[PDB]
Amino acid sequence: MLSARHVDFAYDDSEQILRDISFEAQPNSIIAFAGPSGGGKSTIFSLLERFYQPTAGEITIDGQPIDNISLENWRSQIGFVSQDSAIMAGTIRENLTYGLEGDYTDEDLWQVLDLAFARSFVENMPDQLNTEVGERGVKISGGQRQRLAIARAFLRNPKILMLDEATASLDSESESMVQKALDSLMKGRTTLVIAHRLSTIVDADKIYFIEKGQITGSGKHNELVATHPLYAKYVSEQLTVG
Amino acid sequence: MLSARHVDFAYDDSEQILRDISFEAQPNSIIAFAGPSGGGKSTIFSLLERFYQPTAGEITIDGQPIDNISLENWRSQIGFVSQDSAIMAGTIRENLTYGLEGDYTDEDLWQVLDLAFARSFVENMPDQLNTEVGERGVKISGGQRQRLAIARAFLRNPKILMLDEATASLDSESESMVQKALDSLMKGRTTLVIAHRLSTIVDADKIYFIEKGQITGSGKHNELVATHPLYAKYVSEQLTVG
Amino acid sequence: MLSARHVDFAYDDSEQILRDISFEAQPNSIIAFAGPSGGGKSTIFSLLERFYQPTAGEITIDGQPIDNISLENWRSQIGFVSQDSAIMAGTIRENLTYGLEGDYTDEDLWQVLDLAFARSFVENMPDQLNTEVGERGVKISGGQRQRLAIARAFLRNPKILMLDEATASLDSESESMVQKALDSLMKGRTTLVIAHRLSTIVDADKIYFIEKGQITGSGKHNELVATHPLYAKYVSEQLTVG
Amino acid sequence: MLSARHVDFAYDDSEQILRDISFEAQPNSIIAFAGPSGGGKSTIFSLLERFYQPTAGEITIDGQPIDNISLENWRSQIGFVSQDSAIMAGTIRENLTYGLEGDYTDEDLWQVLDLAFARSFVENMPDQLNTEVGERGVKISGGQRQRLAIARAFLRNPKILMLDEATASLDSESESMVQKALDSLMKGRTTLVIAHRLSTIVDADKIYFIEKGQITGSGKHNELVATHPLYAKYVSEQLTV
Numbered sequence: 001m002l003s004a005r006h007v008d009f010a011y012d013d014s015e016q017i018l019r020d021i022s023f024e025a026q027p028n029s030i031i032a033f034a035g036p037s038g039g040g041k042s043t044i045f046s047l048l049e050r051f052y053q054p055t056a057g058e059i060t061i062d063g064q065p066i067d068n069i070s071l072e073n074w075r076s077q078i079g080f081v082s083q084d085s086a087i088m089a090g091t092i093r094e095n096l097t098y099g100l101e102g103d104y105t106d107e108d109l110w111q112v113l114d115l116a117f118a119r120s121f122v123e124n125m126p127d128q129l130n131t132e133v134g135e136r137g138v139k140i141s142g143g144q145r146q147r148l149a150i151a152r153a154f155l156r157n158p159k160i161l162m163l164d165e166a167t168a169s170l171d172s173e174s175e176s177m178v179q180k181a182l183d184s185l186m187k188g189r190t191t192l193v194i195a196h197r198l199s200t201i202v203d204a205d206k207i208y209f210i211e212k213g214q215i216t217g218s219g220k221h222n223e224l225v226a227t228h229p230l231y232a233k234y235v236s237e238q239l240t241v242g
Numbered sequence: 243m244l245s246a247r248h249v250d251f252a253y254d255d256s257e258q259i260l261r262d263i264s265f266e267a268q269p270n271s272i273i274a275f276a277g278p279s280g281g282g283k284s285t286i287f288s289l290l291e292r293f294y295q296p297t298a299g300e301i302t303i304d305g306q307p308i309d310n311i312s313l314e315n316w317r318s319q320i321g322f323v324s325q326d327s328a329i330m331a332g333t334i335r336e337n338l339t340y341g342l343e344g345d346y347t348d349e350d351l352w353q354v355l356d357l358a359f360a361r362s363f364v365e366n367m368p369d370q371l372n373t374e375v376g377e378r379g380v381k382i383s384g385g386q387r388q389r390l391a392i393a394r395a396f397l398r399n400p401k402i403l404m405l406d407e408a409t410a411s412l413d414s415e416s417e418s419m420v421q422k423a424l425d426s427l428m429k430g431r432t433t434l435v436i437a438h439r440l441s442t443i444v445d446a447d448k449i450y451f452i453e454k455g456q457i458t459g460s461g462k463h464n465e466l467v468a469t470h471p472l473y474a475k476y477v478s479e480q481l482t483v484g
Numbered sequence: 485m486l487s488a489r490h491v492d493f494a495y496d497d498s499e500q501i502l503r504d505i506s507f508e509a510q511p512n513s514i515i516a517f518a519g520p521s522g523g524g525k526s527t528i529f530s531l532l533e534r535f536y537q538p539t540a541g542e543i544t545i546d547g548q549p550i551d552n553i554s555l556e557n558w559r560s561q562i563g564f565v566s567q568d569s570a571i572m573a574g575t576i577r578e579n580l581t582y583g584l585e586g587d588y589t590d591e592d593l594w595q596v597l598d599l600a601f602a603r604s605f606v607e608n609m610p611d612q613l614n615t616e617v618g619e620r621g622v623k624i625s626g627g628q629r630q631r632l633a634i635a636r637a638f639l640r641n642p643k644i645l646m647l648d649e650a651t652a653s654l655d656s657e658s659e660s661m662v663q664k665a666l667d668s669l670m671k672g673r674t675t676l677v678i679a680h681r682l683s684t685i686v687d688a689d690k691i692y693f694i695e696k697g698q699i700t701g702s703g704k705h706n707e708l709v710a711t712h713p714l715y716a717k718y719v720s721e722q723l724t725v726g
Numbered sequence: 727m728l729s730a731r732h733v734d735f736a737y738d739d740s741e742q743i744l745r746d747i748s749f750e751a752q753p754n755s756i757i758a759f760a761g762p763s764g765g766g767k768s769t770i771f772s773l774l775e776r777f778y779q780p781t782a783g784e785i786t787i788d789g790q791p792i793d794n795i796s797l798e799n800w801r802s803q804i805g806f807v808s809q810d811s812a813i814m815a816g817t818i819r820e821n822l823t824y825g826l827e828g829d830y831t832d833e834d835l836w837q838v839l840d841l842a843f844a845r846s847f848v849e850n851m852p853d854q855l856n857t858e859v860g861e862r863g864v865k866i867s868g869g870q871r872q873r874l875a876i877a878r879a880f881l882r883n884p885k886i887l888m889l890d891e892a893t894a895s896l897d898s899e900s901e902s903m904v905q906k907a908l909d910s911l912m913k914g915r916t917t918l919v920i921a922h923r924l925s926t927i928v929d930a931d932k933i934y935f936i937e938k939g940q941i942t943g944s945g946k947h948n949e950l951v952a953t954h955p956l957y958a959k960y961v962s963e964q965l966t967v
């Protein structure tokens with residue numbers, strides 16, 4: 001599994017960002033992380049992607065410390081899919097390819113677009129796979145941009161997967177084909193998601209409630225809601241409505 | 243109606259690809275777009291398919307511009323492109339189900355296979371509707387493949403139908419597909435073709451002859467054939483069989 | 485040595501883009517490509533970038549055909565630096581390595597940023613080398629955005645260099661820290677510019693005038709201006725006052 | 727004049743880093759910004775160089791905002807030196823001629839080294855202005871490296887001079903010509919400091935105390951140390967260096 005035992009972190013000297021954090025996320029599972037803004041949620045992903053180090057306490061992968069045990073070509077194991085004010089500049093092929101691991105066949109890309117849900121909008125597309133996108137190239141509706149991100153993912157083929165939602169779009173119940181592409185992408189790996197969609201929380205195989213740099217809750221929704229007043233109240237106030 | 247109201251277009255500054263284009267398409271009227279490769283036919287379709295912008299003028303649906311609709315009604319609901327050459331494999335249910343937006347019914351699916359005239363190969367492979375069809379088992383053939391692409395169509399139910407025909411005509415079962423299934427598809431709505439078959443043109447309710455970026459003919463085949471030596475040449479040499 | 489012997493090219497059937505094109509780019513030298521827009525100048529670069537194949541000719545490097553070398557190795561020997569639309573998002577460590585092999589650390593990033601004449605202002609930036617750019621992060625000017633690109637180039641360290649100007653801010657008489665950071669990039673490399681700057685040509689070791697698909701002239705500026713009447717037209721009109 | 731009439735800022739959105747900040751920079755002199763680490767000192771500088779755009783209030787110059795030109799701004803501004811590790815420009819010319827202008831002269835370069843109190847260093851360097859001071863030849867120990875730098879700063883004769891100090895390598899001589907040069911540089915400009923040195927704040931013309939993203943002290947040192955039990959605490963414990 002991907003365990004994180006007793007992690008501590010502070011970006012600077014002002015305040016402590018993360019305080020003694022412990023969690024686990026195993027294969028063919030999804031683990032959500034929820035909580036107020038400024039909790040430390042993004043920060044876990046940052047350390048997990050190795051942008052920074054835990055000031056104290058290890059992060060292990062399958063027994064071995066991720067850090068400087070698996071050189072920073074550890075990124076081929078990880079994959080991160082999120083969205084906001086973005087543009088992808090270039091050819092679809094080009095886009096699906098900074099990774100020296102994937103794309104060596106146009107047919108392999110097609111296998112990926114199928115899984116990501118695109119052999120339909122990439123066939124009913126101009127020079128097909130060889131089209132320049134965006135930047136005075138083609139027009140792609142937001143949802144398509146994301147499915148193409150899920151596409152690169154599929155080809156990059158990560159062992160661990162990390163997600164995050166910013167814009168409402170699919171409000172948890174809104175349910176869309178970008179989501180069906182997520183569901184496909186999550187299947188063979190270890191998913192970690194910073195939850196903002198209510199449904200995303202209910203289905204999570206394990207939830208970690210994060211209140212200002214600390215983990216309050218540690219199990220399933222069902223249980224947690226009866227057990228935690230502050231969690232339950234978070235679910236009411238901010239999550240669903242506020 | 244769909245009115246291509248004066249459309250000037252170009253990708254780069256040198257080649258001014260489309261000059262004053264002006265076509266209008268109605269219900270149950272099949273319009274075609276025939277011409278030498280370079281004509282700009284697909285380019286018309288790319289602007290109909292909204293991948294690009296018109297430089298001068300507008301394409302107007304029911305008087306109200308197309309550029310007064312969102313990114314996801316025009317594309318999926320009204321914007322359609324026969325899928326035929328998509329080349330699919332998975333399950334019969336899954337190929338037919340590919341990115342529609344809802345949950346389905348075997349009874350809705352049978353309503354569409356009868357309508358597509360595909361109810362037999364289906365009624366024979368005995369996990370029928372859930373059967374495997376592909377690089378795995380219960381193989382597929384060019385004929386069947388296309389009738390399902392046409393059936394998908396029915397599920398989507400489009401108001402505007404777009405085709406780009408094939409320079410690949412499979413003998414005999416081509417009608418059981420092309421001339422049955424296309425027939426019923428094109429039968430209730432506004433159809434637009436890029437004709438690479440003579441069959442089409444004859445039946446078309448109005449042809450638009452595109453030679454090097456401009457339209458040179460606006461009439462039915464027999465009206466144009468007698469009046470345009472280059473059109474009759476085109477149809478006798480480049481669209482023709484034998 | 486980069487020699488392109490007898491090249492012909494067409495994307496579509498509606499025009500042949502390049503016709504019987506031959507040229508040589510030798511080391512530590514600067515070759516320019518001028519001529520009206522449409523001559524095929526961006527296309528040659530695309531051909532060298534291997535985005536496309538010569539339909540008739542043969543591009544060669546040091547005696548070995550570039551189609552042999554294999555896609556990856558080629559793209560690593562080459563490097564292309566152009567101007568704005570090109571906004572960068574992420575870090576100054578991330579925008580400088582992405583798609584490179586490992587190591588040599590922030591120290592190696594300093595030396596390059598020095599070669600690009602960035603360093604000073606880069607040190608003056610918040611988390612320097614760990615600074616976020618784009619919408620998420622900080623403000624950067626056009627003049628600084630590209631210097632980082634010249635920097636990335638120094639680091640990717642090509643053998644062959646390509647570039648061009650598609651905007652008026654560096655008129656040819658308008659010289660800055662950018663055009664001078666470019667001059668250092670041009671150093672030990674086989675450079676080739678699609679000239680647009682009036683001076684660039686007056687310095688270029690060999691010029692290739694391109695008119696609608698063909699190389700009309702080949703030699704130093706002075707030489708071509710007396711000998712070739714039509715070159716003079718490009719030089720005094722399209723260039724000087726448009 | 728540089729005035730920051732009411733500045734509120736927040737990089738993230740859950741922590742209002744700066745809440746109502748207001749300072750007024752003035753002619754030919756110094757102004758300090760002492761305070762603890764999480765204060766927002768560097769962040770004010772990061773706003774003075776337009777790296778980030780505020781949430782409330784504008785930073786005024788001679789009355790007007792800063793909507794002028796990223797160029798005029800970057801120009802009038804100044805980055806200092808020591809943070810400039812060792813630059814292998816392998817030529818005195820090149821080191822002082824980093825990203826600078828149109829062209830410069832010898833007569834000019836030295837005019838500056840005489841102003842940076844650095845003329846003689848160079849006389850003992852083979853092929854004078856053309857000399858290497860890198861990993862490859864004529865290694866300077868550091869005191870001179872940082873002064874050659876004030877010299878660069880002396881080139882564009884800026885209106886606004888921004889600083890940031892630390893690690894007082896007490897080769898007091900380094901601070902002797904470092905102070906003399908820095909003096910010659912500050913003397914006659916609108917200077918803004920994030921002082922980590924006592925010497926600086928003692929004779930600053932007005933200081934500001936920044937505790938947790940707010941100003942809490944606003945006057946000459948002689949007054950602050952007597953009116954603010956937390957200022958004097960900061961200055962004797964963490965600022966002594």
Ligand SMILES: Nc1ncnc2c1ncn2[C@@H]1O[C@H](COP(=O)(O)OP(=O)(O)OP(=O)(O)O)[C@@H](O)[C@H]1O
Nearest residue numbers: 011012017036037038039040041042043738740741
């Ligand atoms: N670069 C930074 N330097 C210093 N402190 C930072 C930095 N980035 C974030 N922080 C601090 O960490 C806390 C924030 O972020 P985190 O990004 O951990 O929040 P979240 O709670 O994970 O929210 P979100 O996922 O929406 O960003 C903030 O409130 C801020 O004080």
Ligand SMILES: Nc1ncnc2c1ncn2[C@@H]1O[C@H](COP(=O)(O)OP(=O)(O)OP(=O)(O)O)[C@@H](O)[C@H]1O
Nearest residue numbers: 254256257495496501520521522523524525526527
């Ligand atoms: N993808 C393409 N498909 C078809 N034709 C193209 C394509 N790209 C460029 N062309 C054609 O080649 C000619 C253009 O480009 P090239 O890019 O070769 O021009 P240049 O001579 O480099 O001009 P500029 O850079 O100013 O556009 C144009 O007239 C255009 O019709």
Ligand SMILES: Nc1ncnc2c1ncn2[C@@H]1O[C@H](COP(=O)(O)OP(=O)(O)O)[C@@H](O)[C@H]1O
Nearest residue numbers: 253259278279280281282283284285286496498
């Ligand atoms: N990606 C492109 N960039 C520039 N021009 C292009 C591009 N694609 C096609 N064209 C131009 O469009 C015209 C061909 O239009 P197209 O729709 O492909 O023709 P048709 O479908 O009738 O064969 C040609 O002049 C061709 O060079």
Ligand SMILES: Nc1ncnc2c1ncn2[C@@H]1O[C@H](COP(=O)(O)OP(=O)(O)O)[C@@H](O)[C@H]1O
Nearest residue numbers: 014737738743762763764765766767768769770
């Ligand atoms: N990049 C950043 N993103 C979010 N917050 C930051 C960032 N950099 C600094 N901060 C916040 O700004 C405050 C410190 O401001 P800063 O200018 O670094 O202080 P000082 O200059 O006094 O050391 C802290 O609360 C810190 O969390």
Ligand SMILES: [Mg+2]
Nearest residue numbers: 126127495496
């Ligand atoms: Mg084409």
Ligand SMILES: [Mg+2]
Nearest residue numbers: 610767768769
């Ligand atoms: Mg700081």
